[PDB]
Amino acid sequence: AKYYNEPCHTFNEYLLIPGLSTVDCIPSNVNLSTPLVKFQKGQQSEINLKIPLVSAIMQSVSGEKMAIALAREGGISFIFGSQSIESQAAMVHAVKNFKRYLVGAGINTRDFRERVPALVEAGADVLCIDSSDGFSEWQKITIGWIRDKYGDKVKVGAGNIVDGEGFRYLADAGADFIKIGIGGGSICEQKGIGRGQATAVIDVVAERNKYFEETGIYIPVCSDGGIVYDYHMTLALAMGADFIMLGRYFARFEESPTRKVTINGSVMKEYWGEGSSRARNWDSYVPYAGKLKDNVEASLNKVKSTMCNCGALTIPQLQSKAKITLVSSVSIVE
Amino acid sequence: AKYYNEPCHTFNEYLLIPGLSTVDCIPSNVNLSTPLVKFQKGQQSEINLKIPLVSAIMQSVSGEKMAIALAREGGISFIFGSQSIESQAAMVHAVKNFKRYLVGAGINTRDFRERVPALVEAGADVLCIDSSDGFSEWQKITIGWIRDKYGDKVKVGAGNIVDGEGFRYLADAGADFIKIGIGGGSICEQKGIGRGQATAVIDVVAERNKYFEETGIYIPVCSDGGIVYDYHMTLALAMGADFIMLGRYFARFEESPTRKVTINGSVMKEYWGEGSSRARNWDSYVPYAGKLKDNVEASLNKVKSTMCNCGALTIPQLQSKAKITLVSSVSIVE
Amino acid sequence: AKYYNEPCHTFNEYLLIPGLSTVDCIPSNVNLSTPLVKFQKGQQSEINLKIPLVSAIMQSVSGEKMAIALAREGGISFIFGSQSIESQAAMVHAVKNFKRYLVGAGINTRDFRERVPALVEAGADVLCIDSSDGFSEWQKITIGWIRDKYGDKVKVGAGNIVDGEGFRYLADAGADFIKIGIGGGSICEQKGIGRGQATAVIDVVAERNKYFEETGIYIPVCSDGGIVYDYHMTLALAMGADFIMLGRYFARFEESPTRKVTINGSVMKEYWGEGSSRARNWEEGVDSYVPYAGKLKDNVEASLNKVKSTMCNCGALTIPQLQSKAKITLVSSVSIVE
Amino acid sequence: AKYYNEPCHTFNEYLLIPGLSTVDCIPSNVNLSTPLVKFQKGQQSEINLKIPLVSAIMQSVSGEKMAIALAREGGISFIFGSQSIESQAAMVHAVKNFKRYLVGAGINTRDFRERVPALVEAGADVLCIDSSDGFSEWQKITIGWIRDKYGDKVKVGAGNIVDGEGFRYLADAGADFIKIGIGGGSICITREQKGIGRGQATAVIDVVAERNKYFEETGIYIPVCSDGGIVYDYHMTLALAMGADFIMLGRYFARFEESPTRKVTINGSVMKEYWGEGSSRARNWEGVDSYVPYAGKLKDNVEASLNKVKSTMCNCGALTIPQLQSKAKITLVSSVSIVE
Ligand SMILES: NC(=O)c1csc([C@@H]2O[C@H](COP(=O)(O)CP(=O)(O)OC[C@H]3O[C@@H](n4cnc5c(N)ncnc54)[C@H](O)[C@@H]3O)[C@@H](O)[C@H]2O)n1
Ligand SMILES: NC(=O)c1csc([C@@H]2O[C@H](COP(=O)(O)CP(=O)(O)OC[C@H]3O[C@@H](n4cnc5c(N)ncnc54)[C@H](O)[C@@H]3O)[C@@H](O)[C@H]2O)n1
Ligand SMILES: NC(=O)c1csc([C@@H]2O[C@H](COP(=O)(O)CP(=O)(O)OC[C@H]3O[C@@H](n4cnc5c(N)ncnc54)[C@H](O)[C@@H]3O)[C@@H](O)[C@H]2O)n1
Ligand SMILES: NC(=O)c1csc([C@@H]2O[C@H](COP(=O)(O)CP(=O)(O)OC[C@H]3O[C@@H](n4cnc5c(N)ncnc54)[C@H](O)[C@@H]3O)[C@@H](O)[C@H]2O)n1
Ligand SMILES: O=c1[nH]cnc2c1ncn2[C@@H]1O[C@H](COP(=O)(O)O)[C@@H](O)[C@H]1O
Ligand SMILES: O=c1[nH]cnc2c1ncn2[C@@H]1O[C@H](COP(=O)(O)O)[C@@H](O)[C@H]1O
Ligand SMILES: O=c1[nH]cnc2c1ncn2[C@@H]1O[C@H](COP(=O)(O)O)[C@@H](O)[C@H]1O
Ligand SMILES: O=c1[nH]cnc2c1ncn2[C@@H]1O[C@H](COP(=O)(O)O)[C@@H](O)[C@H]1O
Ligand SMILES: CCCCCCCCO[C@@H]1O[C@H](CO)[C@@H](O)[C@H](O)[C@H]1O
Ligand SMILES: CCCCCCCCO[C@@H]1O[C@H](CO)[C@@H](O)[C@H](O)[C@H]1O
Ligand SMILES: [K+]
Ligand SMILES: [K+]
Ligand SMILES: [K+]
Ligand SMILES: [K+]
């Protein structure tokens, strides 16, 4: 078997060390745009978000309201695929025909032959294979089928890998963007598979950067899961992630499709995992945080502020200049 | 004194990182058979289990019912030896002439001269010297006696060492399989001897493989104790263990020779250690879990599924392909 | 991005290993004076404190009474700047004209143009640019303006950096002393910037000593925040810090400008961060309560006697000797988690 | 300042890995004797203990009863010096003329000119300078006075250091044995006061290495004592395996009937008093005051502990302490493992 020369780490084990902040670096001048899909060197991505946040492919988070709300702020949602092809297709259509908003859709490696056409006809701007382990022939086959039928006209995100090898496989398979994260989810012990979210992102980004140099193709990567604090967003971006996928964070908003409940005088909101027995056959609570616009605005202002402490006016600048340190276990145990 | 460059670790400190899962790797195609006794390169072991689980050499777990139930599922039990030579021989016989089922039996380094013949005559398929410290002349003497009288016809497992040095000694002594594990057991501080189960397995396996390349003799090793969760099974196997010995896991079952009791409305089963003042002169409660068949089925289904995430259809494949990472203490401390 | 070969640590992760104690090293002979502002090789700083303690630039700790009480013990306070220029200047004046006591003042990188002249006129002995991130052109600009107008006549501390790069920048910019500390404060998660206080001090100090070899200029550094126990003082000094800035420690005293409240039988004092909403509007911080400890004098005396005693276990009669002779070891997380 | 390439550790962070146990390595064949004072190569120590256990220099543990009981088991006690010279001297005399028993006495760097002569006259077999920081001129001066007046006739242990530098200094001053341990005692708040100390295991390991170098350099073997930090019996085996010739314990002995403290019932539990020598009461004839569980007679406890130690030694394939120190395989354990 193969072992590693060092243990994996989570976002909570790192801190950013300030760099030179110039007079022109004010939060208001910070550009949070980022590429969603792969593009060739010297060119621009066919799809660019204004903000680096995307909502999780979950019944408890990415519904119509969320897709529209998040799209309005510059992000994009991936309508959960744990429902019938018609339902999803409809939701996608609804978002597109609201008055245009970008919308994504999750797909599986089983019914893609009939699921993809529907989503495409429905107007989905981008798809993403949904899996806890994307390092497999099924994703290669699924992605290959899509290229076979739509060429580069259909954008499909892929996987969920945690190392260079997994990244490499999906990159060669054709994926437009690759998703990172196994076990870091807040609602994730069972199979004993996973890796610290921070280490997974750092390792995958290094591989992605090599790949770019080798092929001239820049494949955006998404840090999926593990975001507990706003500053985790800044760390994920600083470590190389182009955009971030969150579930819990969004589940707490008014726009999520879960019901608002009250527990012990506190207004909560339901939130369950896609791997739970209820979604797979198409569980917990999170504090109600209010409207998406208000929250997203706050989190990103904090992100923008921090970027300037690091001397960065753009995400690529941050990824280049960021100084990141590990923190001792005792420091965290405070 | 001799010191080590790194601290020893437990199974809870590791995670498996997915490998390439080919379309044909589905739980129903995974072969969980594994060798029980040493054989020559290129050949096969004389004894091969259908599943890599064996029950502990303890009064509270390996009785007649356990031996039959587990053998049915494809594993094997080592009838406890903290009882008269006549009693133990009786059990071995009952199991053998039930209607054939393989059964093991534990022996000690004191009365082996009469215990082994009785056990052998009763039809025991394999023996195992039972000790908390197999790194001793007594085990070498015992194996030497069995060889003197039966040559290679009687298979004898041996030890319980936690490093390459102990493994090498027992290998050269002639052991058919070597058991790993000191201080990792659930019901185990007193003498300050032991090692993290994970490091012990990793270290002994490395030595076992060197021995293989040097002699062409592959000696199976058993990871004994320390299994808290099902995923720990996959890890032990991935680290090189050919089979796993468990006590607590099996004590919880209906087939264990202990009585079922009720404590606070919760049905429990008695479970005490072989080092306790009662087994030696021939303690706690574990939750009742039901039938062995149903539990073993669920655990191994998880193991099979995980093996496929790792791209392995067989145990030897898992041991070769497995990517294993250490986890930060902060991560575990969650 | 740039990564570090080792995790940062806090003061609670270190212990001092004793050195040779001489017959004459007794607390009563230990000299605790330390330099406040940069000076050249072989020389003496123009401002030397009798004790290495200074109070934080916070509304909840450095008011007029604190300034007088701490100056009396040999230290110095930095009157908070989260108030109008007239009020702060008034405070400085009252301290200087009490009956003379040294006093400092915090300034910002925004209104320094008129804030500095007023504070200087009011009689402030030293100023300090107050910020959670001093690694910025604004600090260089502020010091530049000051040097342009008063040359070396006005002493100004600067920053709050946590690494050699930050120090080097502020040093070249002209700072009279550089303050270390981001995220180690007791009332500090949000932006995720910072570094363990011990590592920050150790790294900045190493850079400060290199700078000294290169330029012949010694720049005193201040370990700001993170002091929980008295022995943390000795450690901070041992690691290279010339003086220590504290907020919580002093807020607990009778002389702090905050009111006293009773929380379940215990007498407490209010203590809120300057990054909180209320101070900025004259949220990097919180609003808490620290146990009332009594008079500054008694407490400081108790803490320092502890420091002096430890210094002698280390074989040092002076702070510079300590920084030179100290044997410092990291302790296992298990040892701490006891 | 000076820093270290690695963090210090406590005894709880180590485990022993078995070695080859030969058929003849049985508890009843193990030799636990050990040298108490320095000797020259190829020679033997003028004082050898039958068991590597000595009792702390504390009012709460080393009184007359303790001294007699432990000496009977093959060890030795160091009568506490936080009392008048006449009192301490009387106690020593009592033990020596009980019916002969070896006994030790603690001394300080203040009144030694009058204290040493009295203790020697009373018949003390060995003295030991009692201090929390033995790395000082005062200890060298004290030892220098003793050498001047009695040459090598009077044996005196010294200090309490935690590193090679402190060891070397005391070794050069002329100490007959050196005590290791600062911040490891149970009744200590590992310096929430001064921030001085070092993990006991690392302190013993480091001091031992220097001791062995000093030996190769001078031919003089100086025994070292691991003082404090012993919680479990296996810590005893660890300390010895790490190179300690003998162990000094406070809490361990305080729990016994022979300790000079009172037995008191606390929540149905029979306890015994135990306070540090740096606590306000002993200094007025650093530490805290407390209770420990009553454990009964010293003989029964020391027998059980040492049986366990001997047994473990054989798991490591050692019949003697020097063999253990040579063959022991010691591993650090991950912090996660400890947090179990
Ligand atoms: N990120 C995480 O760590 C994590 C853990 S669970 C989880 C989420 O939970 C949800 C469920 O994930 P999942 O990976 O179990 C689902 P996925 O569809 O990838 O796999 C389920 C199973 O069906 C089988 N399968 C897939 N495609 C085929 C096919 N074409 N033909 C035959 N068999 C096939 C596979 O062997 C697999 O075991 C996901 O939506 C995901 O976002 N994420
Ligand atoms: N795996 C563990 O960490 C662990 C701890 S306790 C434990 C279990 O508890 C049970 C008891 O283990 P154990 O090691 O005490 C048993 P073992 O028989 O090995 O030893 C018991 C004692 O008898 C002595 N002895 C053994 N053979 C002889 C002989 N031929 N001549 C003279 N003396 C002899 C040994 O020195 C030993 O002290 C075992 O069944 C084992 O599985 N396992
Ligand atoms: N040490 C810590 O970790 C820490 C955290 S909060 C904190 C304290 O809280 C208080 C507030 O600190 P702070 O860093 O927010 C203050 P500072 O003045 O440095 O920054 C506040 C904001 O105003 C802007 N700003 C400053 N000067 C100018 C200028 N001249 N022109 C245009 N914009 C400008 C900056 O970009 C910054 O976002 C401080 O007193 C400090 O001691 N310390
Ligand atoms: N092991 C530990 O970590 C530890 C902590 S406290 C402790 C115990 O508590 C007790 C008290 O220890 P301690 O170190 O305070 C005592 P010690 O006598 O060694 O020191 C007390 C002080 O008096 C001074 N002093 C000593 N001799 C003289 C002299 N001759 N003339 C003038 N001044 C002098 C020294 O400077 C010293 O600071 C000890 O018995 C010890 O066993 N052990
Ligand atoms: O049932 C589940 N178990 C574990 N992870 C899940 C499950 N459902 C979704 N996830 C993952 O975790 C993310 C959510 O992360 P979160 O933002 O920490 O709640 C999703 O995008 C998935 O990758
Ligand atoms: O009394 C005992 N103390 C410690 N370990 C024991 C004892 N009896 C058996 N064991 C060991 O621990 C295993 C049990 O591991 P478990 O499955 O974690 O309960 C056995 O096979 C033995 O190797
Ligand atoms: O609002 C705030 N948040 C975090 N730190 C603060 C804040 N206000 C002041 N500080 C810092 O922390 C120090 C106080 O540290 P303390 O002594 O640990 O309470 C000050 O000198 C500042 O550098
Ligand atoms: O008051 C005290 N504080 C801290 N340590 C003490 C004190 N009194 C004695 N000691 C030390 O700690 C040992 C006790 O160790 P213990 O066996 O862990 O209780 C003694 O031999 C001393 O070296
Ligand atoms: C040579 C003198 C330089 C003085 C520098 C003053 C910097 C004050 O700061 C400036 O204040 C303005 C008014 O609030 C703002 O609009 C600017 O954005 C801000 O940078
Ligand atoms: C090239 C960009 C120059 C920006 C300089 C803006 C200066 C704004 O003006 C400044 O505002 C400060 C705050 O009120 C005052 O203290 C200064 O005296 C004043 O000059
Ligand atoms: K900055
Ligand atoms: K896979
Ligand atoms: K000293
Ligand atoms: K052994």
GROMACS .gro file of C-alpha atoms in nm, chain A residues 2-227:
model
  226
    2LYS     CA    1   0.099   0.368  -0.026
    3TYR     CA    2   0.142   0.610   0.265
    4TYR     CA    3   0.196   0.984   0.302
    5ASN     CA    4   0.484   1.175   0.461
    6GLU     CA    5   0.240   1.390   0.659
    7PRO     CA    6  -0.112   1.391   0.809
    8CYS     CA    7  -0.399   1.563   0.628
    9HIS     CA    8  -0.551   1.884   0.768
   10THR     CA    9  -0.884   2.067   0.787
   11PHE     CA   10  -0.945   2.440   0.730
   12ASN     CA   11  -0.953   2.504   1.108
   13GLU     CA   12  -0.580   2.426   1.127
   14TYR     CA   13  -0.468   2.724   0.919
   15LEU     CA   14  -0.432   3.100   0.945
   16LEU     CA   15  -0.329   3.362   0.690
   17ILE     CA   16  -0.030   3.586   0.759
   18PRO     CA   17  -0.068   3.944   0.627
   19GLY     CA   18   0.131   4.067   0.330
   20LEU     CA   19   0.183   4.427   0.214
   21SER     CA   20  -0.144   4.617   0.184
   22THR     CA   21  -0.120   4.897  -0.071
   23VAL     CA   22  -0.333   5.212  -0.060
   24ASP     CA   23  -0.531   5.099  -0.364
   25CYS     CA   24  -0.643   4.775  -0.199
   26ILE     CA   25  -0.982   4.857  -0.053
   27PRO     CA   26  -1.265   4.602  -0.022
   28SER     CA   27  -1.465   4.802  -0.276
   29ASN     CA   28  -1.200   4.744  -0.544
   30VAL     CA   29  -1.178   4.370  -0.485
   31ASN     CA   30  -1.284   4.158  -0.782
   32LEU     CA   31  -1.436   3.822  -0.681
   33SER     CA   32  -1.507   3.692  -1.032
   34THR     CA   33  -1.383   3.343  -1.111
   35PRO     CA   34  -1.387   3.086  -1.395
   36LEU     CA   35  -1.641   2.803  -1.372
   37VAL     CA   36  -1.531   2.592  -1.668
   38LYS     CA   37  -1.204   2.495  -1.832
   39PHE     CA   38  -1.040   2.712  -2.096
   40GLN     CA   39  -0.716   2.720  -2.295
   41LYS     CA   40  -0.419   2.938  -2.200
   42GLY     CA   41  -0.450   3.300  -2.306
   43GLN     CA   42  -0.826   3.271  -2.339
   44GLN     CA   43  -1.118   3.342  -2.109
   45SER     CA   44  -1.365   3.091  -1.963
   46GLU     CA   45  -1.702   3.061  -2.134
   47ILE     CA   46  -1.865   3.090  -1.791
   48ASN     CA   47  -1.745   3.328  -1.521
   49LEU     CA   48  -1.914   3.383  -1.185
   50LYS     CA   49  -1.908   3.726  -1.023
   51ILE     CA   50  -1.867   3.561  -0.683
   52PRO     CA   51  -1.699   3.225  -0.602
   53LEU     CA   52  -1.992   3.058  -0.424
   54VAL     CA   53  -2.205   2.773  -0.558
   55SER     CA   54  -2.477   2.581  -0.370
   56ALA     CA   55  -2.464   2.206  -0.304
   57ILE     CA   56  -2.637   1.941  -0.518
   58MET     CA   57  -2.884   1.860  -0.239
   59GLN     CA   58  -3.264   1.843  -0.205
   60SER     CA   59  -3.226   2.042   0.115
   61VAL     CA   60  -3.049   2.335  -0.051
   62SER     CA   61  -3.048   2.381  -0.430
   63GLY     CA   62  -3.407   2.442  -0.534
   64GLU     CA   63  -3.565   2.705  -0.759
   65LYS     CA   64  -3.566   2.991  -0.508
   66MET     CA   65  -3.203   2.929  -0.414
   67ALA     CA   66  -3.093   2.912  -0.778
   68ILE     CA   67  -3.253   3.248  -0.853
   69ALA     CA   68  -3.136   3.412  -0.531
   70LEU     CA   69  -2.777   3.292  -0.565
   71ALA     CA   70  -2.771   3.376  -0.937
   72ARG     CA   71  -2.870   3.732  -0.850
   73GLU     CA   72  -2.562   3.771  -0.630
   74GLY     CA   73  -2.327   3.642  -0.900
   75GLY     CA   74  -2.308   3.275  -0.804
   76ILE     CA   75  -2.477   2.963  -0.934
   77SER     CA   76  -2.674   2.673  -0.792
   78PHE     CA   77  -2.669   2.310  -0.898
   79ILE     CA   78  -3.028   2.184  -0.883
   80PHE     CA   79  -3.027   1.852  -0.696
   81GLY     CA   80  -3.060   1.545  -0.914
   82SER     CA   81  -3.213   1.318  -0.650
   83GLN     CA   82  -3.556   1.362  -0.811
   84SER     CA   83  -3.710   1.261  -1.144
   85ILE     CA   84  -3.568   1.383  -1.473
   86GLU     CA   85  -3.889   1.579  -1.536
   87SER     CA   86  -3.893   1.753  -1.198
   88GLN     CA   87  -3.529   1.863  -1.225
   89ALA     CA   88  -3.578   1.963  -1.589
   90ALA     CA   89  -3.874   2.176  -1.480
   91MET     CA   90  -3.685   2.346  -1.197
   92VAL     CA   91  -3.407   2.427  -1.444
   93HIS     CA   92  -3.662   2.569  -1.688
   94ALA     CA   93  -3.823   2.775  -1.412
   95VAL     CA   94  -3.494   2.940  -1.320
   96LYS     CA   95  -3.406   3.012  -1.684
   97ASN     CA   96  -3.751   3.158  -1.757
   98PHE     CA   97  -3.784   3.393  -1.459
   99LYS     CA   98  -3.639   3.713  -1.611
  100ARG     CA   99  -3.082   3.561  -1.793
  101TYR     CA  100  -2.999   3.375  -1.470
  102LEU     CA  101  -2.733   3.102  -1.492
  103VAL     CA  102  -2.830   2.765  -1.347
  104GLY     CA  103  -2.656   2.432  -1.302
  105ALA     CA  104  -2.777   2.075  -1.264
  106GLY     CA  105  -2.646   1.761  -1.101
  107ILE     CA  106  -2.649   1.430  -1.286
  108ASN     CA  107  -2.568   1.071  -1.197
  109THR     CA  108  -2.369   0.803  -1.377
  110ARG     CA  109  -2.682   0.592  -1.429
  111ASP     CA  110  -2.963   0.770  -1.618
  112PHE     CA  111  -2.746   1.030  -1.792
  113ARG     CA  112  -2.838   0.902  -2.140
  114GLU     CA  113  -3.191   1.033  -2.089
  115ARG     CA  114  -3.122   1.278  -1.808
  116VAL     CA  115  -2.869   1.499  -1.990
  117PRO     CA  116  -3.087   1.575  -2.297
  118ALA     CA  117  -3.375   1.688  -2.075
  119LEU     CA  118  -3.155   1.923  -1.870
  120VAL     CA  119  -2.997   2.059  -2.187
  121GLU     CA  120  -3.333   2.111  -2.355
  122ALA     CA  121  -3.443   2.265  -2.026
  123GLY     CA  122  -3.170   2.526  -2.058
  124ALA     CA  123  -2.917   2.422  -1.793
  125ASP     CA  124  -2.595   2.620  -1.839
  126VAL     CA  125  -2.375   2.355  -1.679
  127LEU     CA  126  -2.396   2.004  -1.537
  128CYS     CA  127  -2.201   1.822  -1.265
  129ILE     CA  128  -2.173   1.450  -1.199
  130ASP     CA  129  -2.278   1.393  -0.837
  131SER     CA  130  -2.077   1.137  -0.639
  132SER     CA  131  -1.891   1.072  -0.314
  133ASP     CA  132  -1.618   0.897  -0.512
  134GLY     CA  133  -1.565   1.041  -0.859
  135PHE     CA  134  -1.246   0.845  -0.919
  136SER     CA  135  -1.415   0.584  -1.138
  137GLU     CA  136  -1.479   0.454  -1.489
  138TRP     CA  137  -1.844   0.553  -1.458
  139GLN     CA  138  -1.757   0.922  -1.455
  140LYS     CA  139  -1.517   0.868  -1.747
  141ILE     CA  140  -1.793   0.690  -1.938
  142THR     CA  141  -2.053   0.953  -1.848
  143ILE     CA  142  -1.826   1.241  -1.948
  144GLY     CA  143  -1.721   1.056  -2.263
  145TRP     CA  144  -2.082   0.999  -2.363
  146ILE     CA  145  -2.149   1.372  -2.327
  147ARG     CA  146  -1.851   1.472  -2.541
  148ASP     CA  147  -1.963   1.213  -2.794
  149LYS     CA  148  -2.310   1.370  -2.816
  150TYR     CA  149  -2.251   1.740  -2.746
  151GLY     CA  150  -1.879   1.794  -2.789
  152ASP     CA  151  -1.769   2.100  -2.592
  153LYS     CA  152  -2.115   2.256  -2.616
  154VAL     CA  153  -2.218   2.096  -2.286
  155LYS     CA  154  -2.020   2.179  -1.974
  156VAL     CA  155  -1.999   1.901  -1.716
  157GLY     CA  156  -1.829   1.929  -1.378
  158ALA     CA  157  -1.702   1.603  -1.232
  159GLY     CA  158  -1.601   1.367  -0.961
  160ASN     CA  159  -1.519   1.454  -0.607
  161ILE     CA  160  -1.167   1.346  -0.559
  162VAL     CA  161  -0.914   1.438  -0.295
  163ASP     CA  162  -0.574   1.385  -0.460
  164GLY     CA  163  -0.370   1.454  -0.772
  165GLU     CA  164  -0.433   1.106  -0.910
  166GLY     CA  165  -0.811   1.149  -0.891
  167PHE     CA  166  -0.782   1.494  -1.045
  168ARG     CA  167  -0.562   1.369  -1.328
  169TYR     CA  168  -0.804   1.090  -1.420
  170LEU     CA  169  -1.103   1.324  -1.443
  171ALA     CA  170  -0.899   1.589  -1.622
  172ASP     CA  171  -0.802   1.343  -1.896
  173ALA     CA  172  -1.160   1.217  -1.904
  174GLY     CA  173  -1.280   1.559  -2.019
  175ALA     CA  174  -1.433   1.727  -1.711
  176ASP     CA  175  -1.485   2.104  -1.736
  177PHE     CA  176  -1.425   2.152  -1.364
  178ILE     CA  177  -1.332   1.912  -1.086
  179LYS     CA  178  -1.488   1.897  -0.739
  180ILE     CA  179  -1.279   1.833  -0.429
  181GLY     CA  180  -1.404   1.685  -0.104
  182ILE     CA  181  -1.468   1.353   0.065
  183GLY     CA  182  -1.557   1.332   0.432
  184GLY     CA  183  -1.526   1.702   0.507
  185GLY     CA  184  -1.898   1.764   0.481
  186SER     CA  185  -2.067   1.894   0.796
  187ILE     CA  186  -2.325   1.614   0.776
  188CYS     CA  187  -2.070   1.337   0.720
  189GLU     CA  188  -1.691   0.715   1.035
  190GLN     CA  189  -1.873   0.480   0.799
  191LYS     CA  190  -1.642   0.364   0.520
  192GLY     CA  191  -1.321   0.520   0.651
  193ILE     CA  192  -1.260   0.716   0.333
  194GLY     CA  193  -1.166   1.080   0.310
  195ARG     CA  194  -0.903   1.344   0.360
  196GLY     CA  195  -0.872   1.676   0.538
  197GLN     CA  196  -1.037   1.934   0.315
  198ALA     CA  197  -0.738   2.170   0.326
  199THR     CA  198  -0.485   1.901   0.236
  200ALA     CA  199  -0.713   1.771  -0.041
  201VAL     CA  200  -0.740   2.117  -0.196
  202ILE     CA  201  -0.367   2.188  -0.165
  203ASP     CA  202  -0.274   1.856  -0.323
  204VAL     CA  203  -0.531   1.878  -0.602
  205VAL     CA  204  -0.436   2.240  -0.683
  206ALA     CA  205  -0.070   2.143  -0.720
  207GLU     CA  206  -0.169   1.872  -0.966
  208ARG     CA  207  -0.405   2.105  -1.153
  209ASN     CA  208  -0.125   2.361  -1.189
  210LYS     CA  209   0.115   2.098  -1.325
  211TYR     CA  210  -0.152   1.977  -1.566
  212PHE     CA  211  -0.203   2.333  -1.690
  213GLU     CA  212   0.168   2.368  -1.766
  214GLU     CA  213   0.167   2.028  -1.938
  215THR     CA  214  -0.140   2.078  -2.157
  216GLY     CA  215  -0.212   2.450  -2.163
  217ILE     CA  216  -0.556   2.371  -2.022
  218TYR     CA  217  -0.668   2.540  -1.700
  219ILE     CA  218  -0.926   2.328  -1.520
  220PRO     CA  219  -1.110   2.516  -1.244
  221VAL     CA  220  -1.144   2.320  -0.920
  222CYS     CA  221  -1.413   2.350  -0.656
  223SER     CA  222  -1.360   2.303  -0.283
  224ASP     CA  223  -1.676   2.121  -0.177
  225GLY     CA  224  -1.772   2.096   0.189
  226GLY     CA  225  -1.606   2.172   0.521
  227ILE     CA  226  -1.683   2.544   0.532
   0.00000   0.00000   0.00000
